[PDB]
Assembly symmetry: D2
Homo-oligomer: 117 residues x 4
Amino acid sequence: GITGTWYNQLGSTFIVTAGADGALTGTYESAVGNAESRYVLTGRYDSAPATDGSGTALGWTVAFKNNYRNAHSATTWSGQYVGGAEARINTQWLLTSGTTEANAWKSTLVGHDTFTK
Amino acid sequence: GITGTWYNQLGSTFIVTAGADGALTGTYESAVGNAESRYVLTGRYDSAPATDGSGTALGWTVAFKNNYRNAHSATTWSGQYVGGAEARINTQWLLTSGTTEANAWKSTLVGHDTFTK
Amino acid sequence: GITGTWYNQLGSTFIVTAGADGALTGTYESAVGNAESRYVLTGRYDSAPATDGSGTALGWTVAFKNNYRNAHSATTWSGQYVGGAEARINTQWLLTSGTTEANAWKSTLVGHDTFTK
Amino acid sequence: GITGTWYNQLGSTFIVTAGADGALTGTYESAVGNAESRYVLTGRYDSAPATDGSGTALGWTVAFKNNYRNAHSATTWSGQYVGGAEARINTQWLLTSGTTEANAWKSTLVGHDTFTK
Ligand SMILES: O=C(O)CCCC[C@@H]1SC[C@@H]2NC(=O)N[C@@H]21
Ligand SMILES: O=C(O)CCCC[C@@H]1SC[C@@H]2NC(=O)N[C@@H]21
Ligand SMILES: O=C(O)CCCC[C@@H]1SC[C@@H]2NC(=O)N[C@@H]21
Ligand SMILES: O=C(O)CCCC[C@H]1SC[C@@H]2NC(=O)N[C@@H]21
């Protein structure tokens, strides 16, 4: 279900593997922003969701540093996986950049991503 | 540095190790909500931040499922390590609960936690 | 342009008048939550947006109290208006409920609504 | 108890009057950002809050355009008034800037301000 290759609305690619333990591991490639090639991701998901048609809560983090460049930022996605013919992962994210103390009021962007297979 | 035992304004406890690879691993114990005992966390951080006075960007995730309890929820903290006169982690977070499609509009809480050692 | 009747993805109805002052006034009707009938809204908008084809910044508030009921809550929508053939208002919102101090950590939901005519 | 002159952690100044209907009217002056002098604000508040110790839900908007400047941006504050010894208004905010479609993913900042009398 959650494991596989997903794409959002900006065209970024989320490649993820959901493990026994509730662990998420894989790779993120952004189509936008100060980003090039793939980045490591890690996260967690609820490995025993409610049985009432509820979705599956999950979240993951990407620090946008790889061998090619470093944006000095990290993003976390919070959302849920909804399985089925039209499987989706619906999220909201927070992108925090390293700022000085004086600019910290402006260090965090908020947005929402929708991923489909 | 980031490795260590941190507490937030609620009294929750964040125990982390920062790997040289940009990995964050540890446990989280919440003082509030539908939680008891400790939860695995996993995250990422900028392992080569700027030194221009800027903080260190980081994020992590906790799914609130352990051997004791399952809240069917996942929270992500996005923020930055500030190495001022005091060690501090300022974050904003997103908590998403598993919900049916009907209730998805009301699935996600947002807040802000500050951590000191 | 902004002035008109708008509907979001949940089926809520936003009727507003954009004033010369940069004032937004109207009524809001939610299809979801603890709400019946129309509610008073007020907001503001950039009455002189960039000419580069950027959208128009705006926001508005609704306290969910009227003669029918009082949810002891208030939402604020923050976003931009984009004109043309398929004019749209894309927003993110914050919904804060009155709580005790002990429960302030869970007082605020976050979401996103997209409005069309 | 909401009416009056408030200051936040950044040094911004917030002058409000709460109307009986449940209106919020006033001016806002920002210590930071692409801002100078006063800005009209407007908003709503729960004029009939619970009487169990809960705060009063409120919200307000500021479009950062005035005689002096236009940032092509709007901020909304959502949160609650905690009355008593140290009157507080705890908020979270969304700041949206007019952008083109291409940059829309990065148009919104999120933050939180604490105001005191
Ligand atoms: O009630 C649940 O669903 C478990 C949530 C755990 C508590 C939340 S996570 C964000 C915030 N920071 C904390 O230390 N506790 C709350
Ligand atoms: O339940 C309440 O506290 C009052 C109803 C709030 C409904 C919310 S406001 C954000 C979202 N957009 C809508 O059109 N309805 C919901
Ligand atoms: O720079 C702009 O686009 C306009 C000024 C922005 C000031 C922001 S609004 C949120 C935060 N709280 C404040 O008191 N000031 C900043
Ligand atoms: O700081 C940067 O510019 C690098 C990261 C790129 C931004 C992101 S993360 C949220 C959004 N979703 C997505 O696929 N790309 C952008």
